[PDB]
């Protein structure tokens, strides 16, 4: 039993021409420079929304991010990560939503049930 969680970009509008950590993967932060709910924050800076997959597999919320070989500051680089979080008992798997901020923060939330 597993349901797919859609990655919706938080930001709406559209970006036009602008005024002109390290090479690691993830965790959480307090800011940018328990009841029957679920709430996690992930740093997915190296991945676009189409390169991130969020699912609810049984008692867990799975995050699968992968990007194929791409150029960077020093050479070429391909990255992949798999994160897993437990889903508390009083949380409906259908209530699990996911959004990606323009800063590259993935938030997976589930309203109290």
């Amino acid at each position: 039993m597993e349901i797919p969680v859609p990655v919706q970009p938080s930001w709406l509008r559209r970006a036009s021409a602008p005024l002109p950590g390290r090479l690691f993967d993830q965790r959480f932060g307090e800011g940018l420079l328990d009841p029957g709910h679920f709430s996690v924050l992930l740093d997915v800076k190296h991945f676009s929304p189409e390169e991130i997959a969020v699912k609810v597999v049984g008692e867990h919320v799975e995050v699968h991010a992968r990007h194929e070989e791409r150029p960077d500051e020093h050479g070429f680089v391909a990255r992949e990560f798999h994160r897993r979080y437990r889903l508390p008992p009083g949380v409906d798997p259908a209530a699990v939503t996911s959004a990606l901020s323009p800063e590259g923060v993935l938030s997976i939330q589930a309203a109290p049930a």
Partner: protein, 226 residues
């Protein structure tokens, strides 16, 4: 006089007084000398901050106006019309400076693309708030400025050049949002982005940061449009 006006524009930038910065830059441009790369950027920063503030304000009011046509005043319309008027005046000022002083047949493709993109941008800002046959004229003028700039940039600049990338980004925004051609917008954004990854290694730390930022914007817009 010109040297003083540029110093004052740099002071106004530090103080974040963009209306003052724009006024100093307008005066500096009116002296008749060609702008250096630093000066072009001062002019662009000044007016984009002024118009950006006005555009952000108009959307809030226009959104309230569109929503208040549910549950039930005239003050929103009257005030939206006022701002809109202030925005139109700033765009007309920039467009006036571009046509009477900055847009020239000579010299560098960089400066030519820069000013033609700027012309397309301010016509696009006018199109965001325009309505009838006036809107059609404005859409045509933005399209022409952008196309002339695209032709020059494809022939004279590398695909990783940030002015070229920024121009292609804005023209794709124009196709999607203004000209209601989502297919042309997606195609232009994809092509620009694709031609960019293949050429990134040819860039310097300075140019690389500009292109890598703008490619992320193209990619974000494609995620949003497709």
């Amino acid at each position: 006089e010109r040297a003083s006006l540029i110093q004052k524009a740099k002071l106004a930038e530090q103080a974040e007084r963009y209306e003052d910065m724009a006024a100093f830059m307008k005066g500096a441009v009116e002296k008749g000398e060609e702008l250096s790369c630093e000066e072009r950027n001062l002019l662009s920063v000044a007016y984009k901050n002024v118009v950006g503030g006005q555009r952000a304000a108009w959307r809030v009011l226009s959104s309230i106006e569109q929503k208040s046509n549910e549950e039930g005043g005239p003050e929103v319309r009257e005030y939206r019309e006022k701002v809109e008027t202030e925005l139109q005046g700033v765009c007309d000022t920039v467009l006036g400076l571009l046509d009477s002083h900055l847009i020239k047949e000579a010299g560098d493709a960089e400066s030519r693309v820069f000013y033609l993109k700027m012309k397309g941008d301010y016509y696009r800002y006018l199109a965001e708030v325009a309505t009838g046959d006036d809107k059609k004229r404005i859409i045509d003028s933005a399209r022409s400025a952008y196309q002339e700039a695209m032709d020059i940039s494809a022939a004279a600049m590398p695909p990783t050049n940030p002015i070229r990338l920024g121009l292609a980004l804005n023209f794709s925004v124009f196709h999607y949002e203004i000209a209601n051609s989502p297919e042309e917008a997606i195609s232009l954004a994809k092509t620009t982005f694709d031609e960019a990854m293949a050429d990134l290694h040819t860039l310097s730390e300075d140019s690389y940061k500009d292109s890598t930022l703008i490619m992320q914007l193209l990619r974000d817009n494609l995620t949003l449009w497709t």
